[PDB]
């Protein structure tokens with residue numbers, strides 16, 4: 078089919094994987110070692126996150142996401158201004174502003190050490206908003222390194238009704254996942270440079286790499302579902318539209334995380350592996366496209382872990398920009414996705 082041919086073109090070359098994985102490893106492992114020399118970052122450890130480690134990276138292995146996490150014992154959080162996702166947190170004294178541990182102070186020292194420690198490896202110009210320090214290896218491979226505080230405490234109350242996976246992955250899996258740590262990354266609330274942001278990237282990876290109702294989903298030829306193929310196609314649809322419309326400000330604020338989040342909700346809506354049969358790829362992809370269009374139309378895209386954090390709030394994305402993306406995605410759906418050609 079046309080969609081199968083798209084998926085074929087989006088496959089990663091084994092040779093590119095071998096080269097890129099080796100280059101990323103050498104840089105990451107080196108910075109890990111060097112940060113451990115600093116009194117503040119002694120305890121950093123690696124967590125691999127994002128689409129490469131979820132096996133949904135498309136086209137080229139040219140962008141990798143990692144967390145350098147630090148266990149902070151005795152963490153005490155205070156939710157910032159009913160935002161549900163942003164928190165105050167109360168060798169680390171250098172980062173205290175009062176009794177709060179300043180996210181911006183920690184991020185600035187983290188960035189400064191990496192910049193000094195960095196194979197042709199450069200640091201990309203600071204992007205506002207992002208919690209990451211971003212590197213570029215050999216002019217081609219981007220690496221986002223996100224500092225994170227690790228907490229082994231119970232997840233914050235704003236997550237109590239999130240992760241609605243009980244009919245898909247099971248109640249016992251939901252309980253096991255909520256016994257894992259959670260993370261705080263230095264992305265600040267709109268106003269607040271002291272605040273941190275909840276992150277569950279590690280749980281997103283666990284879900285995508287163990288994604289079936291059947292434990293043997295995608296382990297044999299009889300159970301090769303099309304979940305990851307549908308996420309890849311949604312990602313490519315948004316990627317291509319953002320490229321075509323790169324000079325149109327209306328597409329600036331959309332990201333692959335909006336389609337990842339919508340995808341997780343469609344998995345909740347369609348929990349059975351038989352709703353993701355390979356033979357139904359076009360229908361499954363359409364289910365994902367129509368769900369995303371409904372999210373745009375209703376201005377509703379809840380964070381999968383934090384339901385009262387709406388990614389499609391008018392506070393974050395103007396109605397006009399969602400309507401613009403609706404228009405372009407409807408055109409694609411109505412014309413058999415010419416942007417894929």
Ligand SMILES: Nc1ncnc2c1ncn2[C@@H]1O[C@H](COP(=O)(O)OP(=O)(O)NP(=O)(O)O)[C@@H](O)[C@H]1O
Pocket residue numbers: 126127128129133134135140141142221276277278281332333334337
């Ligand atoms: N807005 C967000 N809210 C929460 N977590 C986010 C957000 N944006 C990115 N992340 C996390 O950071 C990871 C890497 O971000 P990004 O590199 O932008 O996306 P990806 O999932 O890696 N897809 P891509 O790199 O586009 O193939 C995502 O997988 C999420 O786990």
Ligand SMILES: COCC(=O)N1CCc2[nH]c3c(Cl)c(Cl)ccc3c2[C@@H]1C
Pocket residue numbers: 140142207208209221223262264274275276277278
């Ligand atoms: C092309 O890649 C960009 C990317 O990877 N990011 C930029 C935007 C963003 N926003 C985040 C939030 Cl809100 C949380 Cl909780 C955790 C991680 C992120 C990230 C990452 C570092």
Ligand SMILES: [Mg+2]
Pocket residue numbers: 127128129140141142
């Ligand atoms: Mg990525």
Ligand SMILES: [Mg+2]
Pocket residue numbers: 127140141142221
């Ligand atoms: Mg990234």
Ligand SMILES: [Zn+2]
Pocket residue numbers: 288289294295300301302303304
């Ligand atoms: Zn599967």
